[model samples]
Target: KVVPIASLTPYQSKWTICARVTNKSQIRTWSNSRGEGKLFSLELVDESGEIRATAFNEQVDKFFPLIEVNKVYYFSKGTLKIANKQFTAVKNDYEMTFNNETSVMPCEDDHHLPTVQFDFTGIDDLENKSKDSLVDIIGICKSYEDATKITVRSNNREVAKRNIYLMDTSGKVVTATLWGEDADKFDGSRQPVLAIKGARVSDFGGRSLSVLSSSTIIANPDIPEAYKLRGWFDAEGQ
Candidate 1:
């Protein structure tokens, strides 16, 4: 029997969830007091809710290769525990971890599964959101400053940062900053519609956005809002 992800709890020892992998992260390694190991995490979503799942060390090698974003899978025999809000933006309060007995089987026919969902907050509405709050945003890339290297005073580490100005039909403009590799590799020459999921709002100089690790940046998204923005930008927004 299948169970909705929202109903999962630590008390339940046996349950299976059929969900779509909405986001996937690269294998990251850590060497802190907890010891050293490499792991990767994915965001799983269904019609009921969404959750985060992580596979560490051996489990990483066993599952990461088999799972891909936008695929549906049957996940079972995993450990459910409290989520670490510090690291994730998933709406669920609990998270799952893959163990030796965990099973991840791909589902062939998944047309019934829901796709990635976004509640895009327009650029103009950013002022209403508090600083350091997570939000999803989409807008036309009106303009962008060239990537530049800067030394972070607190860490004294040099990194690249690029500032892109976004505007929507609300007739408001806001700045969104992309850092590290994303900043260095971004191409805004075509003024593509950029959609960012889980962007952090900043109060710097009124309001702005800082892309975090949990964020996903999609260029020229296939969503209806993107199509509408493209039309507006070409004809009048420009």
Candidate 2:
């Protein structure tokens, strides 16, 4: 009846899965040896496990806007490929891609399904994570530097990068960097509780977290955790 995310493999085609949209990235374009096209990917999860599904080319325009975060849907008719650890933090052995024939329909009366969840790592414990290791972090934005424009030595493309400083209940501080459009979108006068998923850890300069393609950010979310952090920040953190 339903295929679990962990059971996905290239051999198994024409299967359908029901999952909730946990994170969605802005539509981006790229060009390389494979040529250039528009693409966007969404990270979703179910009670079974977590996985990522990508929609590319015309599929991008067709389904990108239709899929909203935090909703359940039935996805099918896509192809699967072994996931590259260098680019993703999804623990599954494979990832799915969508084509013109791919179908995604919203699921109703999904009360039996669980909402999205994250395994958050503390800022104090991040010192041990290796470079390129994926981490999920949630903390308050203590400070952020103004975006800087730099030239990509390889592609010579000008890009923007902003450094963000975060702090949580551990009484420790951490930094997360956002790039390109997301970097430009970073604008807040004061500290706000922030959460990031599938961020990469870097060993350089001690240790730091970097936002990856599958990352998602929720500033000052209405969750109880955010409410508590705001109270803590006001009393002594600020």
Candidate 3:
């Protein structure tokens, strides 16, 4: 039997939780009055929920090699503690810690796990796609402009329009435009992930993407790219 993330609380002591590793940070070192040690952390997700787990020093050496990004694993006997929100972005109120009794084992991938699939095109490669072609894109909204009223001469009416800049690990930036309510609905605070399905590539003033009514706008989606970008944006991109 496996424990759902929702049922996890500080009161529980021994439970085998099956989850997928959504994000894993590299080994980090810290020095404090208690002592100096190295540690690593993981953002784990399952069908029910998500949480962050940490491994310090010895535990780091034990599980770091076994844990991989986007893989399912069975974690048992890990310690649970009240989370420090300032250091974590996971939605759960509590986090996990690996102690001497903690055990981690890889599990067969479960098809029912809540994950996303996307044929995402890198931001830097948008230029390769000829103008007017549709492309699926995912990237962090590095910056966004306020919604402004634009007069559409074709209809002789004014409409709200906004532009947001998207960047990915490709280290390239592309301007994406949104119209009508989609434009006004975007909030790029904390550099949220912006995944646009079926965005049209444009040649206007170089490479750009336009979010049409047919396009799907997913803000901070439950995708591996979003979690990776979250860690990247927080640690370096900001």
Candidate 4:
């Protein structure tokens, strides 16, 4: 069944969700008061919405290499927690965490599963919205800079973030930020067509929507929207 992400509240748990693996991270590790460990995270998506989940510690070794990007799977029973808004670039109020309760099984019928989808909002519409409003957009990568780090503060504490610039046919330019390992993995060399799902609309220096780490980004989407953009970019952007 289809579900809207906006309808999910913070810390709400879900069961038996089928979604596409739009993006996946390589094995990652972190240390805490507990200890240092390895884990992997992926962005899951359906037509309704998207969420982030991680297979930590031992689970990473079991699932990391098996879960391929751009595939579909059945997942359920994960602990849903409030996404660290300060750290994520998504517009949602909550993010998710997966523990032993979490389960993932590959979909037998991938054809029935929905490819990651986006409701393309025209640039004109985006221009009219208030800053910091969450939005999804499709655009061509006009250009990008080498990743640069900047500091952000929450609760009087400072953190560093890396961001890249993206421009679309809307005749507008925006920033897309990648955090942690994602910052290092992003390669914008092809200047590929971009479709951002759940990008936060934030004003950096002035009025412009900036995509963040929590935002789900699809590069060179083969969907109709991507084709439309491909035509536009080839005809005019060139």
Positional deviation of residue 51's Cα in model 2 after best superposition, in angstroms: 1.3
Best by TM-score: 1
* Model 2 lDDT tens row, 29-83: 9999979998889887877887888998899999988999888888887878888
Top of the candidates by lDDT = 1
Q: What are the per-model numbers of colliding residue pairs?
A: 0, 0, 0, 2
Residue 141 displacement (Å), model 3: 5.6
TM-score list, all predictions: 0.84, 0.79, 0.53, 0.62
lDDT of 3: 0.82
Angstrom error of the Cα, residue 209, model 4: value is 3.2
- Per TM-score, what order, best first? 1, 2, 4, 3
Q: What is the lDDT of residue 19 in candidate 4?
A: 73
Cα miss at 101, model 3 (Å)?
A: 0.8
Per-residue accuracy of model 1 over 76-162 as CA lDDT, tens digit each: 978899998756667888999999989999865445777666778888888999888888888988899999998999969899999
lDDT of each: 0.87, 0.81, 0.82, 0.68
Residue 201 Cα positional deviation in candidate 3, in Å, after optimal superposition: 29
Off by over 4 Å in 4: 1-18, 23-69, 76-102, 109-112, 151-163
The alpha-carbon lDDT assigned to residue 159 of candidate 1 equals 91
- Which segments of candidate 1 are over 4 A away from where they belong? 31-36, 84-87, 152-157
Which residue runs of candidate 2 sit more than 4 Å off their true CA positions? 1-14, 26-38, 99-101, 109-116, 221-238
